[PDB]
Each structure stands twice: as structure tokens, then as C-alpha cells.
Write an enzyme that holds these catalytic residues in place. Structure first.
Site, PDB file in Angstrom:
ATOM      1  N   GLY A 163      46.475  37.476  37.387  1.00 53.84           N
ATOM      2  CA  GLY A 163      45.469  37.585  38.680  1.00 53.84           C
ATOM      3  C   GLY A 163      44.233  37.432  37.830  1.00 53.84           C
ATOM      4  N   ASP A 199      43.439  53.469  43.864  1.00 51.74           N
ATOM      5  CA  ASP A 199      44.723  52.988  43.608  1.00 51.74           C
ATOM      6  C   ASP A 199      45.763  53.695  42.986  1.00 51.74           C
ATOM      7  OD1 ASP A 199      46.424  50.530  44.006  1.00 51.74           O
ATOM      8  OD2 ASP A 199      45.638  49.492  42.397  1.00 51.74           O
TER       9      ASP A 199
END
Ligand code: PQC
Length: 244
Positions: free
Chosen positions: A15, A125
Site C-alpha cells: 500500500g 489503530d
């Protein structure tokens, strides 16, 4: 700050944000090199975020060897966690864990989080994929410097992160641990989760989760942030349980 005393061996990233590689610093230290795709981050984003990570020091927080930014391109150098992501480890090691071992993992992460909380840093996260296992079995928190399955209500309802939202996130991470790497609300769309959660529904008690560990997991999922215990408190609560 590293020039190129680095040796890239193989990778593991993805990514835009950069790739991660297995490498060595000085033909000696095994390290994890996180490079960042060109133009995938403002230079002042990388600069200030990197100097924040290096200002944090705790036994349950992954350490940095230094950074590379002489312009070729740019990378953050971490110590190598021999056993990868807690997520992956629990999965392939499934069926070989003792309840005691799993609880020890949670305590590891709670310790690291208690430190981050006290240092007023929000981890936004906290999940098993962002935790790392070392060639010890020790767990360290990483990625400390939408995923609604890990989000507390005040976060569903447009992003109000805090140290208490991390706690909720920790509760889900605890579920992933005792369920030995299972996917929470696997057969449920974001809508359904938000609906099931807004009705008071919570993830079931994994079999390896004792009635006492599952009470703790539910205090993390209290709808009101003020009702959730602070990591500093969770540490001592989990600690007392581990003692039986
Ligand atoms: N989780 S993995 O990549 O399969 C892996 C396998 C074997 C060892 C490691 N150990 C290690 N040690 C220190 C680290 C310190 C920072 C990062 S960022 C990152 C990453 C980011 C975005 C997507 C995929 C991976 C992995 C690591 C990291 N990883 C990681």
C-alpha cells in the site's frame, strides 16, 4: 540517522506509504526497514512523526535503530521482531496455546499501551496486525508513531479518538488473542456491526477466555468512554486475573 549501512534482504510491505524489508545494519543487526514511497507523505509529516517515535521508550514498544533520509528515498529502521504480527502468529500457532500464554500476550500490549496513554499518545489503530511477536514470545506494540470492527462508538460517530477509544480497541484485540486469531464480526457488514453494537451486543467469549477475562473485555466495550477503565487500570486488573 542511517546513510546506507543497510542491507536489504527481502520485503514484507504494501500500500502506498512504502514497503517494509528484512535487512541488516552493519552486516550485523537484523532489522525491519520501512521505506516510504516517493510523494506518499509530506517530508514534514515523516520528519515530525519519526522524531515522535524516537522519543518513546518502553520494553513493550518496538524500538528504532535510526532513520534514513539523505534522499534515497526515505526509511525508518526498526529492530526485527522475529515472529511477525501477533495476528499471524495466533493464527498459525492456533491450538498450541495455553490460556496462560494468551493472557500474558494481552498483558504485554496493555503495558505498552499504559505507557502510550500516560505519554498522551493515541494509537488510533490498536489491533493484532499492529502488534509484533519477538523470538521470545514477548509482544510489543507497533505502528504507534474504516476499521469499524475495532472502533468504539464515539469513533463510529465521526472520529473522536482518545486513550479510551484505544481501550475499546484493546478489548477487541483481547478477543482476537483468546480466539487465537479469529476475525471479529466476520460475517457482518459495517452497518450491522454498528447496529449490533448500538443494541448492546458484544463479541462472544472465546472458549479460552475465562469468565473473568471476558468481564474485563466487556469493561473495555462500555458504551461510554468514561465508563471504560484506563490502560493503567486494565494492567492491574489483568495482572490480578493472571494470578489465577
Ligand atoms: N507483519 S510481516 O510484515 O508479515 C513481518 C514478518 C516477519 C517479521 C516482521 N518483524 C517486524 N519487526 C519490526 C517492525 C517495525 C515497524 C513495521 S511496519 C510493518 C508493516 C507495515 C505495513 C504492512 C506490513 C508490514 C512491519 C514492521 C515490523 N516488522 C514483520
Amino acid at each position: 540517522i542511517d546513510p546506507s549501512e543497510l542491507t536489504f534482504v527481502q520485503e514484507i510491505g504494501s500500500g502506498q506509504f512504502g514497503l517494509v524489508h528484512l535487512g541488516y545494519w552493519l552486516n550485523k543487526d537484523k532489522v525491519a526497514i520501512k521505506t516510504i514511497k516517493e510523494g506518499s507523505m509530506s517530508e514534514d509529516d515523516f520528519i515530525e512523526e519519526a522524531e515522535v517515535m524516537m522519543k518513546l521508550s518502553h520494553p513493550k514498544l518496538v524500538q528504532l535503530y535510526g532513520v534514513c533520509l539523505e534522499q534515497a528515498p526515505i526509511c525508518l529502521v526498526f529492530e526485527f521482531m522475529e515472529h511477525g504480527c501477533l495476528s499471524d502468529y495466533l493464527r498459525t500457532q492456533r491450538g498450541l496455546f495455553a490460556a496462560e500464554t494468551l493472557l500474558g500476550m494481552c498483558l504485554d500490549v496493555c503495558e505498552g499501551m499504559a505507557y502510550l496513554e500516560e505519554a498522551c499518545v493515541i494509537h488510533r489503530d490498536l489491533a493484532a496486525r499492529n502488534c509484533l511477536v519477538g523470538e521470545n514470545q514477548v509482544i510489543k506494540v507497533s505502528d504507534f508513531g474504516f476499521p469499524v470492527k475495532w472502533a468504539s462508538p464515539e469513533v463510529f460517530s465521526f472520529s473522536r479518538y482518545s486513550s479510551k477509544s484505544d481501550v475499546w480497541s484493546f478489548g477487541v484485540l483481547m478477543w482476537e488473542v483468546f480466539s487465537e486469531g479469529k476475525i471479529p464480526y466476520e460475517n457482518r457488514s459495517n452497518s450491522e456491526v454498528v447496529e449490533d453494537i448500538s443494541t448492546g451486543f458484544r463479541l462472544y467469549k472465546p472458549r479460552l477466555a475465562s469468565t473473568h477475562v471476558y468481564q474485563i473485555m466487556n469493561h473495555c466495550w462500555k458504551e461510554r468512554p468514561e465508563d471504560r477503565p484506563a490502560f493503567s487500570r486494565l494492567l492491574r486488573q489483568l495482572a490480578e486475573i493472571a494470578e489465577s
